[PDB]
Symmetry: C3
Subunit: 328 residues, 3 copies
């Protein structure tokens, strides 16, 4: 009965190997990619009482800078506005050259960062320091006084709405972020929590940043970067109703570096009294990147046949190894 | 000798199957691509304000540079001449009833103003609250059934895709199918008749998506174009022509249909800051590409020849075991 | 004999496992990466223009997606057609030719439309004429592309790239600014493929457009440049030895039916009581910044399964050698 016992042991080993191969979903299921489309819709307000008077309100279309969605969008969090900018010869900015007596600066564009077409003169900047005279946007920026109170910190309570639609080809199955569990009644009193309500897509910017690993009120002065990822891991063997996304906010938390924080200049032009003016904002804001990836598969007979053939081959190899070790 | 001949035949058949089915004698590469989109059309809106505007190439393609994913106007409800002031809040904020209903502070979820607290009348019979902000004129829910900025189904998209193929250092472009010189003045895109001209039509990009354009422009929608470059790159230099498959990317109807956003353009009239606010129900086009390619390399050929010889040995072992 | 054959088989197996360990990196768990970029351009250009009014294009005046978005256009040429307004005016000599008053009909001219045609014939220029259209009145004339390239001083703009990537499976975060690069280097650093390969890629037109392309003709009519950032590093060593490599692509140079890349964009304003717009046909450079990478760590499951595969391949090699010896016996 030694031979029968050995044959039974080999058969059991082969069965276990086949079960392991069919486990982990390594085989018997196809692999397909996905195509995605993401839209965002922020909703909030912000008071902007400024010592320069003229209170202003930043609406939904005033801080979302792409203003129409896109994967990578920026939400304004702070700014240094220099209104009523016009073209004309006047004093330059410091850290770009110091004028001693009509000799420090020579006519021509300066190397690397430039502020205007230098003409050559010692025009008294109203900071006890005399600099060069340039031809450009006359009221130059003053970015030293970054606003500590975080003028638009009230963005902590904004509600981001990530509407995601995907399609798996080769199965022609299309799904959306709004899973049939979430209905209209769950969109008026809905927030997002990773354990309590993991399906409703109405996130809160404060909460998103908090789960990003970045403390708020310190990246508001100089906007950081936040990355949201919507993993779509689904199996088409079961009903399509079991296709749900997983949100993971891998926030690249640094809070201290050589050049920390996002920052960009943007200007809006207009015409007043027949002269072209310009409003320039140095906006610091938090940029959200919404990366979408996934993999789904279903029953196909070719991968099943290939896996069964590989299982037969590895079972034969195992029997060869067992015979070899028994020979020794 | 019969068994040896059968084993040799099985081995050579396996080798041929490995070489010709999965194409194991060639390597693989990724894809780096750039997409440039240039719409060209016109649409006129006879708004009831006696202000007939003309919307041209720079007025409805919202990302003017034409990114990979962009948006085309198909409907709007303009709310012009907006300044900063106090007036009645939109009724979704609440209902006034008594003067004590309104409270100071912003709203909870969707704030429209500071809500200082008063009971001004928004309509002739409905009073909500008093808010300070972009107050004078507020956006409403009056989506135009005739679908203003219609006839967007006659525009001509133009995808000037480019391909890199870094490892093989072979550069290909969508525009040049090695024959395109006068097929650009008068061409369309048909999946069977003219599958090479990249001057699409928004009628022939939504229709093959499986969604009718009659209800797509009312509340917006999403359309996806793939342009996947599946080129053999081995027995040719040309024959890298891409294939297009406009994916449906979800059907219409259902909860929260379509896709609409809001944007605004500021201006100065009499020393007071103003704002033109548009709510846009525009289609969204996404262009995401992929490719594999492949070229003759000796290392993968040797690796798969070794794998084939191993498979042949395993098959011979299995046959010998079965015979015994 | 038998001992020699066993030693040869053991040596072959050892070589096989060494090859599969030091070539395919079997004891590693390859994973993707997530990424974000923040592109900041610095520079200044001045245009005279035949309008007798000098213009200065500032930091936020040429780069249009003025927040990054890893796909942006740095304007290098334009054809300004200012002071446009709604009215009935003549059409461009590309949608039709006005032989007489009956040569044009109301409609949108099918493919390419510049205005709602009315039918009347109005003289334009001197001989060509045209059909009247209701729309933006002064039609654009893009026939005369400026050869001196106007905003041609783009061979000195700096392109500070602030790339931050994260590998989630190992939960590691890295940035473009390698710890070696500090504030003392950012004051004056220029990216070079051999001498300074770590500080972010600067100076469009000198070490960015030198990808088998020439700024001379890549700014007169626009063009496309692709910067790919590869993060190929392993967390087996210290995290310090994880630095990216930049490669600039040469997608095409010239000799094409539709070369370059240009787009029309309009800036609106209101004067007196009428809405006007400035229309720019911007010819620019599209910089596609694409970042990819891969990383792995030593884990027990991959090394166990690769040692099992090595044992299997050693056994199959042994039985193949035995069969060969039997056939050659
Ligand atoms: N940030 C958000 N917070 C709360 N609800 C949101 C948010 N973004 C989107 N929604 C909801 O998404 C749905 C989409 O509908 P729709 O686009 O008509 O909304 P809306 O622009 O806010 O319109 P309305 O002016 O009619 O309230 C709405 O029911 C809206 O309440
Ligand atoms: N729908 C379309 N979108 C883009 N280009 C189109 C379209 N239909 C035709 N074309 C043709 O594409 C060609 C390449 O476009 P290109 O940007 O180089 O020219 P353009 O700015 O349109 O020139 P012009 O206005 O002087 O005809 C043009 O000659 C144009 O006639
Ligand atoms: N495109 C560029 N070319 C050259 N130097 C640049 C460029 N972008 C940024 N820098 C320099 O690198 C640093 C970036 O720091 P950071 O992002 O905090 O900017 P910043 O201090 O807000 O900039 P700025 O002073 O110009 O307003 C600064 O010292 C700046 O001079
Ligand atoms: C086909 C003979 C040789 C049996 C050996 C293969 C066995 C292990 C395979 C073949 C078909 C397989 C099944 C095919 C389909 C399904 C339905 C799915 O919802 C759960 C898994 C399940 C139930 C699979 C389990 C594993 C399975 C039973
Ligand atoms: C050692 C023996 C088995 C010969 C190995 C090579 C044999 C199997 C032959 C069979 C099919 C052949 C390929 C068939 C077609 C082409 C396309 C041609 O443009 C280049 C050569 C190439 C790519 C051949 C390479 C060699 C090839 C793989
Ligand atoms: C025949 C077998 C058992 C011999 C040993 C094989 C395994 C255990 C060996 C072979 C190669 C080895 C690796 C080679 C190099 C390094 C880098 C070093 O910084 C940490 C250890 C690490 C990651 C080793 C871990 C152990 C390792 C994976």
């Amino acid at each position: 009965k030694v031979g029968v016992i050995f044959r039974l042991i080999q058969l059991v080993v082969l069965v276990y190997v086949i079960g392991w191969v069919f486990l982990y979903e390594k085989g018997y299921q196809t692999s397909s990619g996905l195509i995605s489309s993401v839209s965002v819709k922020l909703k909030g307000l912000a008071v902007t009482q400024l010592p320069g008077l003229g209170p202003q309100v930043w609406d939904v279309a005033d801080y979302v800078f792409p203003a129409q969605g896109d994967n990578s969008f920026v939400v304004m969090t702070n700014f240094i506005v220099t209104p009523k900018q016009t073209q004309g010869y006047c004093a330059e900015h410091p850290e770009g050259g110091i004028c001693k007596e009509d000799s420090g600066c020579t006519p021509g564009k300066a190397k690397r960062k430039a502020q205007g077409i230098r003409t050559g003169k010692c025009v008294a900047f109203n900071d006890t320091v005399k600099t060069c005279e340039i031809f450009g946007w006359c009221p130059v920026e003053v970015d030293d006084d970054i606003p500590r109170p975080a003028l638009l910190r009230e963005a902590e309570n904004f509600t981001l709405f990530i509407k995601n639609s995907i399609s798996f080809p080769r199965f022609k199955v299309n799904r959306r972020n709004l899973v049939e569990e979430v209905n209209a009644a769950h969109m008026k009193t809905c927030l997002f929590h990773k354990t309590l309500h993991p399906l409703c897509p109405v996130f809160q910017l404060g909460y998103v940043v908090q789960e990003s690993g970045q403390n708020f009120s310190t990246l508001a002065e100089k906007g950081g970067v936040v990355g949201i990822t919507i993993d779509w891991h689904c199996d088409l063997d079961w009903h399509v109703r079991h296709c749900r996304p997983i949100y993971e906010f891998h926030g690249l938390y640094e809070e201290k570096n050589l050049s920390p924080g996002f920052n960009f200049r943007f200007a809006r032009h207009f015409v007043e009294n027949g002269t072209n003016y310009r409003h320039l904002f140095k906006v610091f804001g938090i940029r959200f990147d919404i990366l979408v990836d996934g993999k789904a598969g279903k029953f196909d007979i070719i991968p099943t046949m290939t896996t069964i053939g590989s299982g037969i081959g590895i079972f034969g190899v195992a029997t060869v190894l067992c015979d070899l070790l028994l020979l020794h």
